[PDB]
Amino acid sequence: MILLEVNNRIIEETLALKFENAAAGNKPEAVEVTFADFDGVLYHISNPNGDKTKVMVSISLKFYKELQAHGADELLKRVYGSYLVNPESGYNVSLLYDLENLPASKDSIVHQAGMLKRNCFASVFEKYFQFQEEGKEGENRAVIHYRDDETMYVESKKDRVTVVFSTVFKDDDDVVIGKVFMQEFKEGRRASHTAPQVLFSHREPPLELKDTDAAVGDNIGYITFVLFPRHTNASARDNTINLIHTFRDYLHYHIKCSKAYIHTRMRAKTSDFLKVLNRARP
Amino acid sequence: AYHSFLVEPISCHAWNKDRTQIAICPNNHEVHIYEKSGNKWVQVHELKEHNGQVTGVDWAPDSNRIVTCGTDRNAYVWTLKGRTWKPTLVILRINRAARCVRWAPNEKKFAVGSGSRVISICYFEQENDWWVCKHIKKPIRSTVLSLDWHPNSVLLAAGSCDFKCRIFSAYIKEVEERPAPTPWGSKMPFGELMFESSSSCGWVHGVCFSANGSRVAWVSHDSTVCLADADKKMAVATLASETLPLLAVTFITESSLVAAGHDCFPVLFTYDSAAGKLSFGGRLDVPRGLTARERFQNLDKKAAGLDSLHKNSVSQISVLSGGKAKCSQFCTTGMDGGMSIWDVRSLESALKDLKIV
Amino acid sequence: ARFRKVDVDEYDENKFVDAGPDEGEVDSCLRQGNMTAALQAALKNPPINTKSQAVKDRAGSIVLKVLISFKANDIEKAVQSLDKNGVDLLMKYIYKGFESPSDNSSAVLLQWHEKALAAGGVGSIVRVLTARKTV
Amino acid sequence: MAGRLPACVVDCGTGYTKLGYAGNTEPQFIIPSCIAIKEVMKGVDDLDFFIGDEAIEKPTYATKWPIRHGIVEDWDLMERFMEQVIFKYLRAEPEDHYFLLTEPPLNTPENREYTAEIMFESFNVPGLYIAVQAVLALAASWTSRQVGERTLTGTVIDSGDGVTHVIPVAEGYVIGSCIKHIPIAGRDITYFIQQLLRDREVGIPPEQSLETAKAVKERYSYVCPDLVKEFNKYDTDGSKWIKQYTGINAISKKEFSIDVGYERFLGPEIFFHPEFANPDFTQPISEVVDEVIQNCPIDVRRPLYKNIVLSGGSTMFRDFGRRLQRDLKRTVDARLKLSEELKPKPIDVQVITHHMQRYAVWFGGSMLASTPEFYQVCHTKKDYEEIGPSICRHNPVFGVMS
Amino acid sequence: ATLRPYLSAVRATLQAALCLENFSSQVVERHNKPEVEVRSSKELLLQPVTISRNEKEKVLIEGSINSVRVSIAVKQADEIEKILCHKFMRFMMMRAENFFILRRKPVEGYDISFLITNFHTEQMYKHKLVDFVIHFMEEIDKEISEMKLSVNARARIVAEEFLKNF
Amino acid sequence: PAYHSSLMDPDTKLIGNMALLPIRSQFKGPAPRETKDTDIVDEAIYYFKANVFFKNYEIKNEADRTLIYITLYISECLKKLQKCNSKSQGEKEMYTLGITNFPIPGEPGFPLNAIYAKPANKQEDEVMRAYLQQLRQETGLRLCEKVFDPSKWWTCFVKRQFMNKSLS
Amino acid sequence: YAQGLLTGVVVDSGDGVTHICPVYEGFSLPHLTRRLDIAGRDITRYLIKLLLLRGYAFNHSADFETVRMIKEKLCYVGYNIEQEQKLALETTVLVESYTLPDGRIIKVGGERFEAPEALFQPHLINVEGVGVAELLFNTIQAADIDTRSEFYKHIVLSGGSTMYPGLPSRLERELKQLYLERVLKGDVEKLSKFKIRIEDPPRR
């Protein structure tokens, strides 16, 4: 697995099992599940008021208000329609499935439910893609604190939309490994001349943000993605979003798997060394 | 002629009067005695008493008593009662590991060098019925690694980690007679320091007295072999080696020494009495014979990468026959667990260039 | 616990207890380009007895200055012009040199080690480790 | 750190791996402990692998089982396995979640360091705790209505597929020197039922003989009190004891139907009568438990008899515990008979059974990792960095006293 | 051009230093300790020597009557090599009990250290240990380079896989 | 453990070390006359399906030896009774196989010669041979009004050997 | 008696208790005699705790004998704890293998000298008072200022818990330290004249 998956398996598999049983005609079993997703996301699937014929799926994001100021509510409503109900206390968005009133094809809803998180992030990107497509420049950028100490900046310009990530490398040595990966992103057009341009700035943020309360420090790194109309138009929009909103975690995921790969190399070499050593015995 | 008794070290060894039995310590708290049966070796005895590793073993030829010392601070005299060896404790009065032990030629006393920076001279009393000892302390500053008695059973040579080779009087007027004068000195009261090497280099791993005792030799960790000549006002000949440190040395004539060590093979040294110079006589273990059987075996076949018999450091060497005046056969034991028997005349034949004495 | 802080061993009564070449003479040879000569002079009267590190680092530098001033292809011959005591002292100096790597001085010093080793054998190195009084 | 995010709980067994978040009653995923790879790695070949079910039938990949006898045998494979457990299934940002992993008793201290080297140095987790399976199984029994006092002193009867273990535990710490293994377990019950079906039923595709056996076992088997009286039931009223099992032929894609009878109670019986199937082992499980408890310290060989707990698929069998308690009590009583004859206070023998037995270990782990105490005993990233992986050698037991 | 000359000097020094023997403690009744570690008897310690290839690469060899300590300064050209080397040396030190001649920690100023005692020279051919140390120095440089190429190769594939999907 | 017989009595008679247990039968033989509703042949048949799986059997009474013999025989009857297409046909197989002379204690072929005492003289040899035959008769006669349905649940054991021994 | 002594101090440590019995040219002196509530059982118990922090959990009752055997075979007294700790943290020379009764092999290192340190630092195992050395010291200093030197140069160990390699050496160093601080008030100058020879008989 190179690219991170977009959908949440716990959600889909939980709803599928319940839908499969409601269709078979079995008495509904109670469901109570708490789980998470990347970036501080907390979920809750349960039976509101103990009614086993109802299954609620709720998501909690510490930064939901910021996404709300950028069309999150409207977008979630277009997608989920009547499945979207008043948010369960402690969460920002709640989907309610009536096991007694399910659609003929329970497939697209199970799929859309699995993308609750992704759909919560969707609007901020759509809003700024639209700006670029309407030549509306000068619009204040979106500032999303997707993690306690990380920030994403979205901004629309005349011919391009930029997404900036201010990420942290808790592990000091993870910065060094990260730079190797960032260098490759930087020269990426050498393999896809049409793909987004990618910049990287070690301790300091891009100059446009040097006047804001942006973070500075040895374990901080800034990555900028420059998206073009071919990526922000109505035809590529969704794929572009599924990719871009996973980037941050994609970078860190690969930094870690890389360290796991080096471990296998170290086991093989240390192992070989032990044989030579033992081979020195009479 | 090499034989492998084991693969771990032979810490120390000792042969009886007839060279019919060899006592070895296999990196243990024990001493195994091997006897030869036909052309094979057979273990006949197993002396278990020490509670630590055995570091020295010496066999008094006529009385047939074996003495041992170990890291357990103890020493034991073994007597053969019928078919089994029985140990008798000898309190050395030391608080550190014993390192070496040698019976005096007269078998009336034995000496133990230890980590207590002292040498314990032990003798028996036929009144209280046990062993006692006097300590030779000054001016020893470190662990005593080796000993060798002078033929008069009084003068005693010692090598220490304080980089010195010394000769002391171990005279015990309760078992022997006032000793006769020697070029080393006329005054030999107990503990008297007769001679002390001059140098602050290398632990002295081994010391040996020539057959008549007028010469003393020792090998140090700084890869030098030395010889002090009492007939030449105790002048000292020194020879610096181009190879690794020697750990054992012995005279094979009044003017020839054979030594071995970390290089893993015996070498010959000769002394020029007139020039007072030590010279490298060459390697003795060199990798087609004179006899039919030999020519056959020595013929090469078709087809531890070391070109020496021993595969690890040789730590001890002893004269098997011919004494130290005209040695004919000598023995080597080492950290590889091997024991090799070398024949002086064979070496002379196979090495036309060899020049002894 | 305060009483265990002091190392009483420091005062035990059973513990063991153990002026350089001519700067001008060397420079004179170097300037005239007589390398071998400069070396033999530099390997003279080493500070084996002075307890001063300054005097020792001085003899070391004079020696190092000569070794570095040598041409790779001329090291052998020079080394072969020394007697055994010379080679031992040389080796002791080559080792002293490794402790002060500079503008590739160790590249040539390794050439010196190679030749010094060929002349004095591993025995000469052993005597560097065994020295109580050294350069 | 005890925060808004629940800890991750991963229980890696020999056959299946249970994973999910602390607090939940069932695992969120239960997958085969296997990883399928391709077979000098370059680029990202190390990432081309699958795990669990996705890894069992993969046409162009070779299926490997990193775990044998409950212990990691291939660390490279275990490490990659964890990558998906975290980033693909749990979907947990590993730096925000404390982790609770499990280990069989007897797992070496070195292995704990190897495990920590992975969790802290590859995945940079903030906290790690390695709990021993048996202890968690004890903690799991605290859910039963039979117990009113929490305790980590008991006898754990763990039976998976390979071997069954009788593990005595005293105050949270397994008494390793007194463990005993039994050459009878899941695979022995399956192979046996296989023969019974062969010597009678026809239609079972010889290629799916094992499948059918393992299926019938966990769908119809159980433990009866008396073999003859039972054989007397199936024969007198066979119309209300003989069940049917229809299955799918592989090649023909056709449903064949066989009868299920005597094997129903004969399968599980081998626990109490090993001689039925194993020519080398003949100790009834009731005897082995007794033996183990008798070998333990005198002062603890009573709290043990009173708290016998079950864990593993092989203990799901209806009446397994009841039969175990009965037999063990007949033994212990018979013995104290010859003492009065040849008046020791009677021995209370109790075998606990509960609803969370299939995944007792993960359940216990999930319940313990969702408490404040868990966060106190876990070793932190900071402690790992300042003291070293040796701190993970010991994991303080908790959950009882307070 | 400077590799072989460097390793040759180091190999010869190792032969000189690896001439050990069993030595019971002189300071502690019935103890046996590696003198180069405890250093409680100055006369048992040999002169520390160094072999350097340049300002960065070097080997410190400390001998004593019954043990030798060997510390190596590994070549680290840039940051990725520095961190790979540190992780690799840490990796081996953690497994020191299996790699019985390794110190659990390097001597201050070095990346990795060995502690070879008389028991080791008694149980293994000393010339094979010397071979191992030299072999070790060469092989770690090679492994570090391969690790470096790996991280770069996987990084390129990772950047493309992501970029090519837009 | 295994299922044992409870028919042993202080007055029960012996033939070798096998219990000469009463059997409600008509066939000729030294078997005593049984007045009760159940005899050793009943027990053997009742406990068969269970006992056949055991490999170890403690002998507690001379009656157990008698029970063990009938048990081992029941299996034999199953061998034949298997390939039979009628209860009446099997009724003749039990008669035919009942008269067939199987080995007895003391002879090679008889498993368990270490457990069963052999006949001490010619009389015992004849009496024991007869008691055994009479048992093989009544047993085989009761085994038919069972195995047949007016059964694979009796045929399945055909491959199982009690104590891993066989009369064949 | 054995050593031909009439007056001296006997330090005795067994499986259950430690006594410091001073004796003057004839018989004991119950007034000076002292006791240390730390001995064999205590060290063995402590080893068990130490091995637990190492990943080996031995039951206190079920395995007591096994851990006792490990103690007798591998434990010893440290001379300079700071130096011992460095050998344990930085190297592996202290690590020894030990085969348990069931065949499993465990590795024992620093705990080898750590368990017996309890004798010198009771607090380590939650016991009050000073260590055996300090106790011995006080016992002697609290006696006839005329028979002191006689005592010091005649200290004799007895009992199973006194066989730990290095014990005699540790005692001496500790006493020398106690003397340098509490009898010479830092005057290192006159330490060399202080005589202490702790007899370690080959028949303890």
Ligand SMILES: Nc1ncnc2c1ncn2[C@@H]1O[C@H](COP(=O)(O)OP(=O)(O)O)[C@@H](O)[C@H]1O
């Ligand atoms: N309900 C059940 N009744 C009896 N046996 C079962 C049941 N469920 C599972 N089993 C058996 O439990 C055993 C589980 O073995 P294993 O694959 O090792 O699982 P795990 O690794 O989780 O312990 C198998 O023999 C399986 O057939």
Ligand SMILES: Nc1ncnc2c1ncn2[C@@H]1O[C@H](COP(=O)(O)OP(=O)(O)O)[C@@H](O)[C@H]1O
């Ligand atoms: N070699 C040894 N090193 C340390 N302790 C030992 C050794 N041998 C025995 N012990 C311990 O000494 C104690 C037994 O000594 P002993 O004097 O017989 O006890 P006691 O005097 O109370 O009967 C036990 O704790 C035993 O484990």
Ligand SMILES: [Ca+2]
């Ligand atoms: Ca498990």
